[PDB]
Each structure stands twice: as C-alpha cells, then as structure tokens.
Amino acid sequence: SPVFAKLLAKNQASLCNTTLNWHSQDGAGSSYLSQGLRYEEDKKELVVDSPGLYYVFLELKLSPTFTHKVQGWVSLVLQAKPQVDDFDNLALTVELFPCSMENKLVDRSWSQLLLLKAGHRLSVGLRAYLHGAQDAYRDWELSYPNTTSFGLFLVKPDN
Amino acid sequence: GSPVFAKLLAKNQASLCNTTLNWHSQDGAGSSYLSQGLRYEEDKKELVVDSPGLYYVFLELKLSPTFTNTGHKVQGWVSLVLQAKPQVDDFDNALTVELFPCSMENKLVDRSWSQLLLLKAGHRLSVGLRAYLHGAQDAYRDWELSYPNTTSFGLFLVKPDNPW
Amino acid sequence: DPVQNSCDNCQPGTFCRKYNPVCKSCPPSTFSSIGGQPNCNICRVCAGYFRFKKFCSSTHNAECECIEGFHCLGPQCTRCEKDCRPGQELTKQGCKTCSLGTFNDQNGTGVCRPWTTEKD
Amino acid sequence: CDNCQPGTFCRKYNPVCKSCPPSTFSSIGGQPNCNICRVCAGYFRFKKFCSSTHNAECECIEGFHCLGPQCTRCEKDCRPGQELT
Ligand SMILES: *[C@@H]1O[C@H](CO)[C@@H](O[C@@H]2O[C@H](CO)[C@@H](O[C@@H]3O[C@H](CO)[C@@H](O)[C@H](O)[C@@H]3O)[C@H](O)[C@H]2NC(C)=O)[C@H](O)[C@H]1NC(C)=O
Ligand SMILES: *[C@@H]1O[C@H](CO)[C@@H](O[C@@H]2O[C@H](CO)[C@@H](O[C@@H]3O[C@H](CO)[C@@H](O)[C@H](O)[C@@H]3O)[C@H](O)[C@H]2NC(C)=O)[C@H](O)[C@H]1NC(C)=O
C-alpha cells in the first residue's frame, strides 16, 4: 500500500516563531495519514515507519488582515530528527512587499526528495520577520480556509 | 507493487502563449522523475497513467518579470489547466495567478495547485498554458515562465483501485 | 424511528463516509453544522486584529470580530479596518469621507449630516 | 562520477557517465543531473544557443539592453551621447 500524508496547520493564524501543530485525524478537513505513518500531537512530529526516498512538501498560504507599507518574510522550516545532510535548503521562504497586500492569498510551495531512515521524526517550524508598521506582525496571518499544509509520499522504498 | 510518482519540469518555454506545455521527463533532465506505470508521450505532450486509482495531481506555476520600467502598469492573469483525455470529474474548475502593476517588484511570482483525482487505466494528462495580459502594447512580453526555478507538473498514486 | 444505514441519518458534529456509513465525531478543532458530510471543516482562529465572538464547537465555526479601534470588513469578517476619523462615517465598503457640504465631528463613532469635513 | 566530463550526468549509486538529455546542458560533469536550457524569447534574443556543455545566453532585441548578471531583465536604450540623456 502507498505511504502518503497531507496534514493541515492546526490552530494557527498569528505569524509567530513557533513549531506548528497539524490536523492528522481522519475527518479533520482534507487531512490524510496512511498506514506507514503516525503523528505525535504532543511532540508535533510526523513519524515515518519505513525507510526510503520520500517526496516531502510544504505549502505556505498567507492572507493580509488589514485594508502603511509592510514588508518582510515568512518561512516554513522542515525539522528532521535525525538530521538529513542538507540542513540549509530545507526551508520555504516567502518575501512580502507592500504590494503583496493586493493578493487575497499569497501561496508558495516547497518540495524535496529526501532519504529518510526508519522511525524518522519530522516537524515544521514557523518563522517570520515583519516590519514597516507598529502592527507589522498582525497585518499577515496564515490563510483560512485554504490552510497551510505539510506532507510526504514514499517514492522509492529502500532495498 | 512499486510507488507511482512523476514530477515533470516545463520544457523549452518562456513566452506566455495559449498552447499545451511540453515537459522534461527523461532521467537527468534537471530534477525530472518518471516512475514505472507512467509514460510521457513527447509528440502528444501527454503523461500516460498505466494503473487506475486515486491520484494526487499537482501543478506549480512560476513567473518572472522581464522588463525594468515601473512607469507602465501591467495587469492580468496566467493559468495552468489540467487536460484529461479519458476525462475526469472536477470539484474545482485550473491554477490561476493574478498579476498587478506592482507584481513586477517580485523576482518570482509562484502559486501551487493540488487535487485528488480518480484516474482510469491508460489515462492521458496534459497541461495547457493560458494568459491574458493588458496595460501596455508589450503586455505579453513583460512576464515569462521563470528560469531556472521551473514550472512543474506531477502526480502520485495515493490509493490504487486494486491495492492487493 | 430513523434507522437506515446512511450518512443522511447522522447528526451535526459528525463526519461520515458514503461507502461505509459510520458517524464519527469531529476531530478536535474541526466542526460540522450539517451531519454526514465526508469531513469536518477546520475551525477559524481569531487572533491579532481579530477577536472571538463565538468559539469553535463540533457544530459551529468560531466567529471573529475586530479588536477595539477596528471594525469588520466582509461577510465573515475576513479583514479589519481602522475605526473612522472625524470627517468620515462607517458605510458598507468601510470608512468613507463625508460628501460635499457634510461633516462628522465624532472620532470612530457616529453618522454625518450637512448642518472643513470635520467641523461647522 | 564527478570525474565525468562536461555534457554528462552521473549518479553515485551506479557510476556511469550518461550524456545530457535532448534540451539540457552541464558545464561541470560530475553533477547528478543536467541543467535545463534557458529560452530567449520576446525582449530577449539568442547570443549563444544551448549545447550539452553550455546554456543558451540571451541578449535583448534592438532598442533594448541587458540588465543583471545573466541578462534577467531588459531595459529600453537611452542614448550613447553622454549628455546624461
Ligand atoms: C522570529 O525570528 C526571526 C529570526 O529568524 C527574527 O528576525 C530578525 O529580527 C531582527 C529584529 O527583531 C532583525 O534585525 C534587524 O536587522 C537589520 C539589518 O538590516 C537592522 O537594521 C535592525 O536594526 C535589526 O537589528 C533581523 O533582520 C531578523 N532576522 C533575519 C534573519 O532577517 C524575528 O524578530 C522573530 N520574530 C518574533 C515574533 O520575535
Ligand atoms: C488566451 O486566451 C484567453 C482566454 O482564456 C484570452 O483572454 C481574453 O482576451 C480578450 C481580449 O483579447 C479579453 O476581452 C476583453 O474583455 C474586456 C472586459 O471583459 C473588454 O473591455 C475588452 O473589450 C476585451 O473584449 C478577455 O477578458 C480575456 N479572457 C478572459 C479570461 O476573460 C487571451 O487574449 C489569449 N491570449 C493570446 C495569447 O491571444
């Protein structure tokens, strides 16, 4: 059977420097968690049971809250335990400009083919830096209902 | 059996025409990947699915401005449309990006699309590039498909109809 | 009396799959106001400029309002706008300057009348 | 694998020096994949066409000049008079 997961960000609007929580249970929107995986709510980690080459993806969805130029960046960082050699290029980063507020949704994707070991723990960190106004961080939020997502697929199992 | 996965990259495209896109599918053609149970017919610009089941199909559109003059306001939209030859049922009727006069301040304008679709055996899939740009006499030339961060298209078999 | 093996026979606060009807309760922080939809909807979160009016439950979404000094814009309060200054009034499309020969002397409250855009 | 010449791609798991697919290039060789060729259209015109060892290189159509390291944008010509116009 295929190994696939697509989790949706849980209870996050504000652009904090925090480890995101995810909807993984069946019926939690379009969230899906196949048989070869599990999500540890208390540790905010996706546990991979079988080793192999995984296509890991992140999708960041942001929306303006206000209707004052506000600029900066928002980031989704894949946090692997144990670490995968590539630590640098494992982050989805969106740059925001005063122009960006003209869009109802600012969407950006990240995808990477990664070799994962058995019992691999994966979590996602939310990072942001916004300036330009006293209310800079409040001017952008993680989009609703088109929710920020995180998932993976087993492309080639090891042998 | 073995997992079914594809990630194709847009082949020889910059200009924003109204045609069906070509894709890199050969091993060693950038990050392009084509597993077993999948074929790419270059002459028909179609991805052929061998096994039926529920497929997670995705599109990623990457655009970049070509001009420097900020004085001439360019607006419009660019779209990537999934074309199914054996045909499929759709809940949402295409990846569409809106461009504004100030979008030119961004080195890259990126947007993604994903959908879980029931595909039949021998399903033919192709992608159409659509665009409507106005605001200047050179509207069409002011945006191009980004290079080297290339527009991509792929899928993966989430649940086969015959899993066992 | 309703006893049939169907997702039509299920209550709000549940999700149900047509192929094998079971009516599972909504996962935490998800809701369903109608019973027997294939999934529950993710709850809206009210933070920053937005504050809660209604909190999320298994049968209803959270509803937002804007923090003091700001008001809602949009059907489901999708954006916040700063409360009007004198010389303006609150309308459908938000804070709008009072017309030819009209003025509003109040800050952030009130409707303007004809007898500067803020005084006389 | 890396010892491979330009115009090839090689993978560590089974080292073979395969030539670059049709519309791709590799100026190094040791790389696990070949790089996709740039296309010069609209404001951009070809200088160098793509080969297995070099990317296509763009220039701008007459009346316009390149801006950026790899000619990523085109700017309208001003004048060569040196009269600050
Ligand atoms: C969340 O963490 C990020 C780091 O990932 C924090 O961003 C950093 O914030 C500081 C100010 O708080 C920025 O420093 C500024 O640097 C400029 C240099 O151009 C200087 O002129 C300023 O005086 C100031 O020191 C810094 O640039 C930025 N990080 C990066 C890498 O750009 C952020 O503040 C954290 N957010 C929260 C919620 O606290
Ligand atoms: C590629 O195909 C698209 C359709 O998917 C073409 O876009 C359409 O272009 C026409 C004009 O060329 C637009 O019509 C204009 O409409 C406005 C207001 O509706 C009106 O003021 C004008 O007089 C004019 O009729 C039309 O809006 C647009 N399509 C859409 C989405 O509505 C496009 O022209 C094609 N591009 C190429 C490469 O030819």
| Contact A17 CB / ligand 1 (< 6 Å) | yes
Q: Which amino acid is at A47?
A: V
Which tokens in the block code for residue A28?
């939690």
Tell me which residue of A41, A25, A149, A142 sits closest to C30, measured CA to CA.
A25
Interface check B66 vs D, CB under 8 A: yes
Cβ–Cβ < 8 Å for A131, A97: no
Please give the residue range of the domain that contains residue C90.
67-120
Residues C54, C86 within the same domain: no
Least CA distance to A21: which residue of chain C? C29
- Residue A10's alpha-carbon distances to A127, A128, A152, C46, C79, in angstroms, are 16, 17, 18, 13, 21
Ligand 1: residue whose CA is nearest its atom 10: A129
Q: Can you read off the two tokens belonging to residue A95?
A: 């740059």
**Is residue A121 within 8 Å of residue A45, measured between CB atoms?**
yes
H or E element at residue B111: strand B109-119
- A35 C-beta closer than 6 A to ligand 1: no
Least distant ligand from the CA of B19: 2
Q: Give one word for D36, left, alpha or beta, with left for phi > 0 and alpha for psi -120 to 50.
A: beta
Angle at A31 between CA A28 and CA A33, to 5 degrees: 115
As to burial, measured by CB atoms within 10 angstroms (0-12 exposed, 13-18 middle, 19+ buried), residue D12 is: exposed
Q: How far apart are CA A54 and CA B5, in angstroms?
A: 11
- Alpha-carbon distance of B124 to B118, in angstroms, equals 13
* Ligand 2: nearest atom to the Cα of B130: 1
Does chain C touch chain A (at least 3 C-beta pairs within 8 Å)?
Answer: yes
Retrieve residue B120's tokens: 């039949």
State how far the alpha carbon of A27 is from the alpha carbons of A9, B89, C22, C30, C109, in Å.
Answer: 14, 22, 12, 8, 44
A93 ligand 1 Cβ < 6 A: no
d(CA D8, CA D30) in angstroms, rounded, equals: 8
Cβ count within 10 A of residue A26: 13
Tell whether C39 and C52 lie within a shared domain: yes
Domains delineated in chain B = 1-164 (2.60.120.40)
Q: Is residue B133 a contact partner of residue D42, using CB atoms and an 8 Å limit?
A: no
Whether residues C31 and C48 fall in one domain: yes
CA distances from B160 to A93, B1, B49, B164 (A): 34, 10, 12, 9
CA distance D73 to D49: 18
Q: Name the method of structure determination.
A: X-ray
**Structural contact between residues D19 and D8, judged by C-beta atoms closer than 8 angstroms:** yes
Contact A43/A150 with Cβ under 8 angstroms? no
What is the number of structural domains in chain C? 2
Task: Indicate which ligand has the atom closest to the C-alpha of A131.
Answer: 1
C59 and C16 both lie in a single domain: yes
